[PDB]
Ligand binder design. Sequence first.
Ligand code: BCL
Ligand code: BCL
Ligand code: BCL
Ligand code: BCL
Ligand code: BCL
Ligand code: BCL
Ligand SMILES: CC(C)=CCC/C(C)=C/C=C/C(C)=C/C=C/C(C)=C/C=C/C=C(C)/C=C/C=C(C)/C=C/C=C(\C)CCCC(C)(C)O
Ligand SMILES: CC(C)=CCC/C(C)=C/C=C/C(C)=C/C=C/C(C)=C/C=C/C=C(C)/C=C/C=C(C)/C=C/C=C(\C)CCCC(C)(C)O
Ligand SMILES: CC(C)=CCC/C(C)=C/C=C/C(C)=C/C=C/C(C)=C/C=C/C=C(C)/C=C/C=C(C)/C=C/C=C(\C)CCCC(C)(C)O
Ligand SMILES: CC(C)=CCC/C(C)=C/C=C/C(C)=C/C=C/C(C)=C/C=C/C=C(C)/C=C/C=C(C)/C=C/C=C(\C)CCCC(C)(C)O
Ligand SMILES: CC(C)=CCC/C(C)=C/C=C/C(C)=C/C=C/C(C)=C/C=C/C=C(C)/C=C/C=C(C)/C=C/C=C(\C)CCCC(C)(C)O
Lengths: 48, 48, 48, 48, 48, 48, 48, 48, 48, 46, 46, 46, 46, 46, 46, 46, 46, 46, 94
Amino acid sequence: MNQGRIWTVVKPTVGLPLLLGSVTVIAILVHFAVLSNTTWFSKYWNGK
Amino acid sequence: MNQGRIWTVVKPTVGLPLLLGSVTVIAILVHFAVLSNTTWFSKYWNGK
Amino acid sequence: MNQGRIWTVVKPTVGLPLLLGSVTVIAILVHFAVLSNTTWFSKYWNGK
Amino acid sequence: MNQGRIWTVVKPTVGLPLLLGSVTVIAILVHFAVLSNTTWFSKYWNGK
Amino acid sequence: MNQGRIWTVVKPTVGLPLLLGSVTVIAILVHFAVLSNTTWFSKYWNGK
Amino acid sequence: MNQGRIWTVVKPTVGLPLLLGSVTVIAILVHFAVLSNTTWFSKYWNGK
Amino acid sequence: MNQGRIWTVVKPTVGLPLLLGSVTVIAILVHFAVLSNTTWFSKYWNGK
Amino acid sequence: MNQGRIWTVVKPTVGLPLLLGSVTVIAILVHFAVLSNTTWFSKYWNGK
Amino acid sequence: MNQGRIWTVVKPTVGLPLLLGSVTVIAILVHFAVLSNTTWFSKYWNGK
Amino acid sequence: NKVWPTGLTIAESEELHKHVIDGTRIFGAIAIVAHFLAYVYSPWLH
Amino acid sequence: NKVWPTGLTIAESEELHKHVIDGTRIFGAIAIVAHFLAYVYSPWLH
Amino acid sequence: NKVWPTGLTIAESEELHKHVIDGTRIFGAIAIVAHFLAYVYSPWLH
Amino acid sequence: NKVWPTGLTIAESEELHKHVIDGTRIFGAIAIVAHFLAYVYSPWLH
Amino acid sequence: NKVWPTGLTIAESEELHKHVIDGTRIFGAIAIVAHFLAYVYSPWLH
Amino acid sequence: NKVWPTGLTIAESEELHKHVIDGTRIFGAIAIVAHFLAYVYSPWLH
Amino acid sequence: NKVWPTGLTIAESEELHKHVIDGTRIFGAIAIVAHFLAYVYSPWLH
Amino acid sequence: NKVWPTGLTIAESEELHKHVIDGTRIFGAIAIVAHFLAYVYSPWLH
Amino acid sequence: NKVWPTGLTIAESEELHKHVIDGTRIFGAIAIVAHFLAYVYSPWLH
Amino acid sequence: EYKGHSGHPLILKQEGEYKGYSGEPLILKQEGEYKGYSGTPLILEQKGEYQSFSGTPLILKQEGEYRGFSGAPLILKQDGEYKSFSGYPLLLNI
Ligand code: BCL
Ligand code: BCL
Ligand code: BCL
Ligand code: BCL
Ligand code: BCL
Ligand code: BCL
Ligand SMILES: CC(C)=CCC/C(C)=C/C=C/C(C)=C/C=C/C(C)=C/C=C/C=C(C)/C=C/C=C(C)/C=C/C=C(\C)CCCC(C)(C)O
Ligand SMILES: CC(C)=CCC/C(C)=C/C=C/C(C)=C/C=C/C(C)=C/C=C/C=C(C)/C=C/C=C(C)/C=C/C=C(\C)CCCC(C)(C)O
Ligand SMILES: CC(C)=CCC/C(C)=C/C=C/C(C)=C/C=C/C(C)=C/C=C/C=C(C)/C=C/C=C(C)/C=C/C=C(\C)CCCC(C)(C)O
Ligand SMILES: CC(C)=CCC/C(C)=C/C=C/C(C)=C/C=C/C(C)=C/C=C/C=C(C)/C=C/C=C(C)/C=C/C=C(\C)CCCC(C)(C)O
Ligand SMILES: CC(C)=CCC/C(C)=C/C=C/C(C)=C/C=C/C(C)=C/C=C/C=C(C)/C=C/C=C(C)/C=C/C=C(\C)CCCC(C)(C)O
């Protein structure tokens, strides 16, 4: 909340796509991590 | 519905390909996830 | 049929290769998925 | 046959190497698929 | 704290995205390392 | 021998490296394929 | 201490991020090596 | 010894790095192949 | 000691990073090779 | 108004974003139907 | 009208998009038949 | 003030970063609700 | 006629695409023969 | 002073690096707390 | 004749492609010998 | 003196390398400590 | 003679390729000895 | 003499390459010692 | 003109406009504002400063030297030469 000068030196053409991208990549990885290492999430999809 | 100015600073030649692309890559990854980690989807293709 | 202006802002030298390429890559991936996860498509090549 | 204007908007310096290259890559992938998922292609090399 | 001249010769357009990015990648890798090589972290998610 | 004009629209600085390079990559992949899927080639190195 | 002129011909915009980045990557690899190939480092995190 | 005009159409700044690099990448791949598929080379390092 | 002119046609901004980088990558690969394929180097870290 | 570094004006960008949101709402509508079918014809919540 | 940043007019873009849609409809038509063949000659729904 | 090398003034940069923070606060709000749901319906903290 | 953004006229593009289609038809014919040979010797349909 | 090849003066570089160091020290502060919590709630040293 | 977008004339392009054709023939001749030797010494067809 | 192709003089490069060397000496010093800690607390040579 | 698109003349290109030829001969000459040693000391043909 | 396409004269290139030769010799001289230590303290030839 | 080996024709070409094989229309015209399908509105028109959600404040101003949240100092100054932290010399010279 005090860093807002950052876009004077980091170009938003790289900044926003890398921000919006890597945050989504982290979300994917956390879902894969919990999926690979828990029974309850795997069972949730398997249903029944 | 507030960000309509983003294309003034993120170039559509990268923003729109990455948007449409990564949404598809997410859909691929969710399909591989449910396929690899469920019986019923694996069975659905094996048929009978 | 509603989006036909997209090529005013997405350059065809990238948007057409990426459309044709990714549609092919999606097809390759669905084949490898059904191959890896079914008996009959594996058996279909193995013959007899 | 109607698409012969595509090279007015997709540059041949990329479209031709990608077309020839990806056709070769698709060929390699279909060979590796049948090689891995069939006995007879594997046995054809193992000989006797 | 000696190196404050570095941005005279390393461009912040590359410097800051790599610095923020690789630190985030290192954080991910250390979580995957401890997740793979410990019972208690995996057991923490599995719950019960 | 019809395509003698291809180097008018595909630049030799890319076409010749991609040609010589990918041919070599194909040779490597075919060697690895026969190595992975035959007893006699593995035995040819293992000796005696 | 002889190579002080190397930055007259290697551009710091690439040579410094690669020097800092690769040394970090090397360090990450040596940690993953010793983690995978030793009991005690695996045991150290598992604790008790 | 007939191709010596190739450097009029393939730039040495890419052709020489690709040559020296790929020749080394080939040598690495051959060593990994003989290592993974022979007893005597695996034993040569183990020594004793 | 005959190639001293190579830097007239290979640009030091890439040839020096590629030389120093790849020589390091070679050393990493040889260490991983000897590590994965010997008892004594694997044991050296594990102690005793 | 000025052309910004992407070459669009603010008004052109806002007209562009009308497509992105309409497309996203269309994608949402199809996906909600696809989830309803996947609920009816799979054991997911069932 | 003006050339937009891609170098196309709106009319040249819309004339181009006719190709992209015709190609998609041809691809869709072949795929519908290929699914019917796979339904007949495989256990998928059968 | 001057345009900096990215082509934004300080004031334009600050008005951009307002969106990044508001976006992050909206992301954080949805994520907290998602964690509350995942607590209520999973063995995570049980 | 004008040179389009790739540097080719429409006529030069269509002259190029005659090679791409001729190459595709040659490749298709050569591939059909190899599928016939594979059918003859392999158990694929046999 | 001159603009260096990155487009920043020395003083502009110093003003930038003050943010990087402050950000690093904030990251360090959060990490110490996160390790302390992990020490309390895991067998790590415990 | 004109230099085309690659900076070669048609005559320079054709004189280049003669090297590609003759190089491919030398590769083919060397490869055929390697397949013959492999047939003699391996069980491939043998 | 002349600017070399990287945009630095010899003296600016040599001053730059003073930072690079010192940065390695600091990294080396921390590493010798971290190895000594590992020798004391791990079985590595112990 | 002209500088070609790579910036070399034909003579500069051919004087370069003499290094590529003789460099390949030296690499070949070492590789023969390395293979001879491998034949002598390994069960390869032995 | 002229600057070649890399920006270096022949003399500047040859003065640069002396660093690459002696850098390789230093790396070789360390590597011979590292191999000698591995021969003494590991079963490689031993 | 290219002859080709796989017979004739090798291409189809069309005089006035593209005629589709998959029937007509191939595209929809748009005479004005975007006539979206998923109802309205499609955007919110920002007339002034950013009328954010998630409350206020939304940024903190900087009015001088940066006040580090981790205290001070944030930098060590340099004057006349690089003060080494690992002894001298740092460089040899030719
Ligand atoms: C010999 C194999 C040659 C070939 C040689 C010829 C010759 C010679 C002629 C054509 C002609 C035609 N070719 Mg051709 N052509 C081949 C590949 C193709 C393929 C493809 C593989 O997809 C297609 C779609 C076409 C398309 C066509 C039509 C435009 C046209 C047929 C009109 C006609 O009189 O019809 C009735 C059809 C016929 C008389 C013959 C049709 C032959 C079919 C198309 C061959 C298919 C390949 C076959 C199964 C495998 C051949 C293997 C090779 C021997 C190695 N060619 C290959 C590369 N083609 C003719 C033309 O221009 O007429 C005005 C013509 O004179
Ligand atoms: C079938 C071979 C061609 C084809 C040839 C034609 C022809 C011929 C016509 C159209 C017509 C129409 N086609 Mg078309 N079209 C194809 C692919 C498509 C696809 C698709 C997803 O595949 C779509 C959505 C469309 C869209 C449409 C509309 C733009 C148009 C008016 C429809 C209507 O309400 O008309 C009224 C009509 C009907 C209720 C029935 C029309 C059925 C059409 C002929 C076939 C549609 C696809 C079919 C159901 C599925 C694939 C079949 C297999 C390929 C065998 N085409 C393929 C590539 N199309 C019509 C038109 O332009 O009218 C002015 C028309 O007569
Ligand atoms: C196929 C149907 C269309 C659709 C057709 C319409 C129509 C028609 C109207 C709106 C209107 C609205 N739409 Mg819409 N809209 C769709 C998708 C969306 C989605 C979404 C995430 O999918 C959202 C958030 C919106 C947003 C909105 C609001 C801006 C607005 C007021 C809603 C309301 O409660 O109206 C009152 C309630 C209704 C009109 C009932 C239906 C509203 C809900 C939101 C639609 C849900 C669709 C469902 C998820 C998918 C069904 C798909 C099947 C193929 C049929 N649309 C899909 C793509 N939308 C309205 C408007 O402009 O008001 C001023 C309006 O008249
Ligand atoms: C409705 C959910 C909205 C929201 C709506 C509001 C509203 C409404 C107000 C603020 C206000 C504030 N918001 Mg907000 N805000 C949200 C998310 C955040 C997050 C975050 C990480 O998620 C942060 C750091 C902030 C930051 C802040 C401060 C700038 C300010 C005073 C906080 C305080 O002490 O309130 C103390 C508590 C109150 C004033 C009452 C409760 C207000 C709401 C619930 C925010 C409390 C903060 C808390 C972390 C939110 C968690 C929400 C749950 C995920 C549902 N908002 C989400 C997106 N925000 C206030 C403001 O600007 O006043 C002038 C205010 O009144
Ligand atoms: C509240 C936590 C804040 C913080 C708030 C402050 C405050 C407040 C002050 C400093 C001051 C200092 N800080 Mg600070 N600082 C933090 C993080 C750091 C870290 C780090 C790796 O995390 C470092 C290396 C520094 C560095 C420094 C020095 C430059 C300076 C003198 C320290 C000293 O001996 O004070 C001796 C002591 C004092 C004057 C009073 C007590 C201050 C204590 C010692 C601060 C310890 C922070 C500790 C190392 C890291 C955080 C622990 C976690 C919060 C659990 N800060 C975080 C972000 N910092 C001080 C300063 O400017 O001195 C002139 C000062 O007053
Ligand atoms: C924590 C200590 C500091 C440090 C503080 C100093 C100080 C203080 C001095 C030097 C000086 C020297 N330093 Mg220093 N230096 C460090 C790290 C290094 C490393 C390294 C790989 O880590 C190297 C190779 C050097 C190199 C050198 C030489 C150029 C020079 C002594 C030459 C000599 O023999 O003079 C003859 C011998 C002497 C004058 C006295 C003995 C000096 C000894 C040899 C310094 C040994 C440092 C030791 C290996 C670091 C331990 C790190 C960990 C704390 C374990 N420094 C670390 C970061 N350095 C000296 C100088 O500038 O001289 C003009 C000096 O007095
Ligand atoms: C891994 C596991 C187990 C689980 C993973 C779990 C997980 C993380 C899931 C995450 C899911 C996420 C995040 C989903 C996100 C989905 C989103 C964001 C969808 C967006 C869709 C966007 C569309 C459809 C855009 C269409 C644009 C269009 C049509 C644009 C048209 C533009 C034009 C015509 C130019 C006009 C020019 C002129 C104005 C001049 O006319
Ligand atoms: C992995 C698992 C288990 C599961 C995965 C499941 C999963 C996710 C599946 C997803 C599937 C998806 C998304 C499928 C999407 C398919 C689509 C979109 C197909 C599109 C086809 C488009 C075509 C054919 C375009 C041809 C364009 C053409 C020919 C253009 C020609 C242009 C010209 C001539 C230029 C004119 C210039 C001028 C003269 C006008 O100026
Ligand atoms: C692996 C395991 C087991 C575990 C992994 C554990 C692990 C490490 C987890 C790490 C997690 C981390 C780090 C999470 C970080 C999350 C963050 C940072 C989220 C950020 C969200 C940002 C957003 C939503 C930004 C929206 C921007 C927006 C909307 C911007 C709009 C801009 C505009 C309109 C331009 C205006 C132009 C003009 C001013 C001219 O008008
Ligand atoms: C995996 C297995 C089993 C085995 C693998 C084993 C294996 C191979 C290990 C290999 C290990 C290796 C090789 C390690 C090498 C480590 C090295 C070399 C470390 C170097 C550190 C360098 C640093 C810290 C540099 C900082 C520079 C800095 C901060 C520069 C600052 C510059 C400024 C301020 C600009 C000034 C501007 C103006 C001049 C105008 O004042
Ligand atoms: C996988 C298995 C089992 C097995 C794999 C087996 C296998 C294949 C192994 C292969 C190994 C190979 C090939 C090893 C090769 C090693 C080599 C070649 C090492 C070379 C080192 C070079 C160095 C250190 C250069 C330093 C340059 C320097 C410092 C340059 C300084 C320049 C300056 C100062 C600029 C001056 C500008 C001015 C002022 C003059 O204008």
